[PDB]
Design a binder for this molecule. Structure first.
Ligand SMILES: Nc1ncnc2c1ncn2[C@@H]1O[C@H](CSCC[C@H](N)C(=O)O)[C@@H](O)[C@H]1O
Lengths: 265, 265
């Protein structure tokens, strides 16, 4: 009769909360999805061992089209968990899953966990200054999507930071790197020429948030576009004008060039 | 000689991540602050029992003025942890503390935890649609803060949602309720008359996120301004333009008036 939405956190199997782990261990059935994001610092095997339950992995279609026939039936007379990377209900379409639960006469509860939305705070950029967020998608065939470029434009114009998620094809396990994201953005700039993303734009790269040894780098596109940020996933941020305190953190912690202390403040 | 910034999460001691607990259990000294937020479902004793350590609680002054004198000295020869509610670097000025650690020659690591910033996902509002965030501060003497009103205005103009952190004065054990925030906003509207926040404005209230039964309510200010949302902490959210599914969730899950289902596009 109960469905638990449980977040797995940012990087490895230890990123789940004590509450989430204990509730998971008490569930009769455990489902999970790894198409929205992938726990880069662990494996399905390590997660299964930690929880001590077999985990029924679900594809995007399994969730979006058949959540009510794969998960809810069992949740009708059993305690069931639905695990997701990060914090539950962050993925755009997940909140609607609680409506499906209600319609099926199933109670649902949310067990939160760390999300990149809040973890980006490790970049030293003030959370209140982030504006609209967006995802950088790979162009394909005749389709060249660029809305993420306009998001950056509108935020920066108002002195706000722009959090950019990078493309991911979970099944094929192919991640977009910050480097690719930058090259793509320079290409969009050459097209729209809005003076939004250029070689002189200051950017911040966060790789493997959640691990004890994450890669936090800041600098100008001209110097970071070919830098090695390590293994994915990578998150790209285009900060708005900086607070001197944000700039000092980027210089002292993220190795940003002292130049930002005068140019981007 | 390491310093760990470890978040404790949204509501109770079980909101800490497994990673954070295991690392906290093995630290030589443990410090913490409980003035940046309120963890309504736990006590200092419960947290201490969980990590099996005595916790040296610090005031805002101990931290902001004496962090390098109270915490860092020990972090130079021991493994020290500094615990905080939610995520340690979200809507706090704790990030600058890492710069202090660096200057004292102390390495620091950050262990994230669920934060109110991402927990907004439980309101059904698409998290990528949130714009600039703000804090509703208690007026003091002849000083009446109003900047948060302009933030709402700016976001609303762009069709973006506005997350409003609410004031807190731990030493006075004062925690601003969503009701008090609504009253202050109506007063600012009376002054600026921008048509930004009125009795007909749709708002969302999230109280005690992290608990199994948080209060999630959506409706017009005129109807919610006097509604009892339970014990603090609370956050107030002023949505921008709603997607059909955001409206459906507010109605089905947050008990919003069915009339908001009809969205003006
Ligand atoms: N569990 C909770 N439920 C509702 N609001 C919360 C909350 N925890 C924090 N807040 C909101 O945030 C304010 C503190 S701001 C500090 C936030 C913290 N670092 C985090 O990551 O969550 C509170 O005054 C309140 O308005």
């Amino acid at each position: 009769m109960v469905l638990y939405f449980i977040g797995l956190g940012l990087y490895d199997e230890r990123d789940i909360t004590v509450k989430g782990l204990e509730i998971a261990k008490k569930c009769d059935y455990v489902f999970a999805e790894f198409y929205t994001s992938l726990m880069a610092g662990t494996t399905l095997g390590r997660i299964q061992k930690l929880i001590g339950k077999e985990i029924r992995v679900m594809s995007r279609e399994d969730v979006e089209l058949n959540f009510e026939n794969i998960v809810l039936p069992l949740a009708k007379e059993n305690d069931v968990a639905f695990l997701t990377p990060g914090d539950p209900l962050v993925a755009t379409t997940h909140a609607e899953l609680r409506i499906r639960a209600k319609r099926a006469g199933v109670e649902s509860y949310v067990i939160h966990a760390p999300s990149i939305y809040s973890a980006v705070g490790i970049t030293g950029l003030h959370i209140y200054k982030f504006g609209k967020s967006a995802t950088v998608a790979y162009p394909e065939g005749n389709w060249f999507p660029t809305s993420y470029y306009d998001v950056i434009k509108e935020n920066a114009e108002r002195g706000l930071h722009t959090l950019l998620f990078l493309d991911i094809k979970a099944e094929k396990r192919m991640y977009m790197t910050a480097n690719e994201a930058m090259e793509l953005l320079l290409k969009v700039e050459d097209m729209k020429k809005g003076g939004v993303f250029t070689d002189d734009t200051l950017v911040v790269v966060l790789a493997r948030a959640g691990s004890l040894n994450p890669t936090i780098r800041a600098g100008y596109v001209k110097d970071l576009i070919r830098e090695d940020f390590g293994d994915p996933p990578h998150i790209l941020i285009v900060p708005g004008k900086l607070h001197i305190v944000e700039a000092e953190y980027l210089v002292e912690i993220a190795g940003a060039p002292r130049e930002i202390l005068r140019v981007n403040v």
